[PDB]
Amino acid sequence: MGQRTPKIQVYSRHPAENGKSNFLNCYVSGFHPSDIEVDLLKNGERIEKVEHSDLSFSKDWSFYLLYYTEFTPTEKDEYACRVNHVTLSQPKIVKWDRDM
Amino acid sequence: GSHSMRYFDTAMSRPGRGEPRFISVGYVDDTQFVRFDSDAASPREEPRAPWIEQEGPEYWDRNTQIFKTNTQTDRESLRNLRGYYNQSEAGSHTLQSMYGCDVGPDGRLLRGHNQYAYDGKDYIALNEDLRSWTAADTAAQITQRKWEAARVAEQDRAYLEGTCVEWLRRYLENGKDTLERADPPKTHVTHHPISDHEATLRCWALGFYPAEITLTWQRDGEDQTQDTELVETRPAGDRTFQKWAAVVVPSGEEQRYTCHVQHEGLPKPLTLRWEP
Amino acid sequence: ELKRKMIYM
């Protein structure tokens, strides 16, 4: 069976401003099959009650999901997204980089 | 001024964990307006646009009953396809479909769509004529035979030319304030030194709707396609989308580079440069 | 508006 590994982007809904409430996003896309595990991290630890979009897919049949949580960015707090998929031997971690 | 309606359906078997999950999500352009999920704990929750809620209980009851029928049909289809491919009962398989219509500014049909994929591979599709099928392999040829025998294309054509176009019109009218509004990108260019001799120029587009956008870098007015890093357009979570394009440029040569932005919400295309 | 899928593949 043909499998496709997820692409991952981590970013904020609005331009990041320390002390200002925002939303932290992890967009996973381009994957097949649809089962996937996605975690948002704060300084290395799992955020609870993260929300996600409804399973859909692109014209090329690959799936995508948006995982999101409200957050207030600060100078010290480090964020990331951790993704597992059948195509991945080990969970992949992508750090939040305000410039990307 | 043109618009589309599309449903994205996914049926996914899960041996040992119940009957296959079926989900059908409806979109007008890049706006999800309904979702039906066989795993829904409460149909009172299956989210829907405000302009769908105004359609009343008759609409919802009718669509819920179509969804239930579609769930059964695609579950049985998964069973049949497993047989056509001589596959065991042990593995999970995925049957996807997309169907719907594209219309112009006048609301007239441009074309219809109804196609399917099995385990991520194209399986069968209704041709643009809305009368004939393209089957990918000898398994899909069986589906084609069954569907030709039952005159399915004629029913699909009636939906695509009639129902789909008529409801897309209704939805565009009821949801006009959002559906017919294009929000232009907010743009800026950032500069990130990489080393003493190179820097990254990143051209940003934020807050735009619909998702379609063109974002390019030029050097001395020549497209930099090969040298541009272009991320996938990504949802912000508030209906809008984001994208960026970046190029690595020699220090001091920044002014030779221009970022070009095209989008439906812009009065005119943008040309942007790094502004130190 | 959903399209009816009636005929098994």
CB contact under 8 A, B94 and A2: no
DSSP three-state, residue A27: strand
Closest residue, chain C, to B123 (C-alpha): C9
- The verdict on B191 touching A (C-beta cutoff 8 Å) is no
Closest-CA distance, A45 to chain B, in angstroms, reads: 23
Q: B147: distance to nearest CA of chain A, Å? A: 22
Neighbours of A94 (CB within 10 A): 17
As given in the structure block, the two tokens for residue B210 are 């619909």
CA separation for the pair B10, A31 (Å, rounded): 14
Question: Are A66 and B47 within 8 A, CB to CB?
Answer: no
Contacts of B10 in chain A (CB under 8 A): 34, 55, 57
| Residue B130: half-sphere exposure toward Cβ, Cα within 13 Å | 17
Q: Which CATH architecture has domain B1-181?
A: 2-Layer Sandwich (3.30)
Residue that is written with structure tokens 């008759």 in the block: B58
Residue among A56, A54, A24 nearest A39 (CA)? A24
B36 near A53, Cβ under 8 Å? no
As a whole number of angstroms, the distance between CA A94 and CA A73 comes to 17
Q: Would you list the domain boundaries of chain B?
A: 1-181, 182-272
Count of alpha carbons within 13 angstroms of residue B112, beta-carbon side: 22
Distance CA B39, CA B21 (A): 7
**Cβ-based contacts of B96 with chain A (< 8 Å):** 57, 61
First vs last C-alpha separation in chain A: 34
Question: Total domain count for chain A?
Answer: 1
Resolution in A: 1.4
How far apart are the C-alpha atoms of B233 and B263, rounded to whole Å?
13
Q: Evaluate whether chains B and A are touching (3 or more beta carbon pairs less than 8 Å apart).
A: yes
Residues of C in contact with B74 (CB under 8 A): 5
Count of CB atoms within 10 A of residue B104's CB?
Answer: 11
Q: Which domain holds residue A34?
A: 1-100
Interacting residues of B51 by C-beta distance below 8 A, sequence separation 6+: B33, B171, B174, B175
CA dist B219 → B33, B128, B253, B259 (Å): 42, 41, 9, 9
**Number of alpha helices (DSSP H) and beta strands (DSSP E) in chain A:** 0, 9
Instruction: Using CB atoms, list chains with 3+ pairs below 8 Å to chain C.
Output: B
SS3 readout for B97-134:
EEEEEEECCCCCEEEEEEEEEECCEEEEEECCCCCCEE
Strand pairing of B94-103 and B109-118? antiparallel
Q: Rounded to an integer, what distance in angstroms lies between the CA atom of residue B51 and that of residue B176?
A: 9
Distance of CA B1 to the CA centre of its chain: 18
Indicate the angle between helix axes B56-84 and B138-149, nearest 10 degrees.
130
Question: CB of A71 within 8 Å of any CB in chain B?
Answer: no
- Beta-carbon neighbour count of residue A31 at 10 Å? 25
Decide if domain B182-272 falls under CATH 3.40.50.720: no
> The domain spanning residue A25 has which CATH number?
2.60.40.10
* B119 contact residues in A (CB cutoff 8 A): 1-2, 33
Q: Which among B36, B81, B146 has the least Cβ separation from residue C7?
A: B146
Q: How far is CA B251 from the centre of its chain?
A: 40
Q: Return the HEC string of chain B.
A: CCEEEEEEEEEECCCCCCCCEEEEEEEECCEEEEEEECCCCCCCCCCECHHHHCCHHHHHHHHHHHHHHHHHHHHHHHHHHHHHCCCCCCCCCEEEEEEEEEECCCCCEEEEEEEEEECCEEEEEECCCCCCEEECCHHHHHHHHHHHHCCHHHHHHHHHHHHHHHHHHHHHHHCHHHHCCCECCEEEEEEEECCCCEEEEEEEEEEEECCCCEEEEEECCEECCCCCEECCCEECCCCCEEEEEEEEEECCCHHHEEEEEECCCCCCCEEECCCC
> Which residue(s) pair with A12 in the sheet?
A24
B155–C5 C-beta distance less than 8 A: no
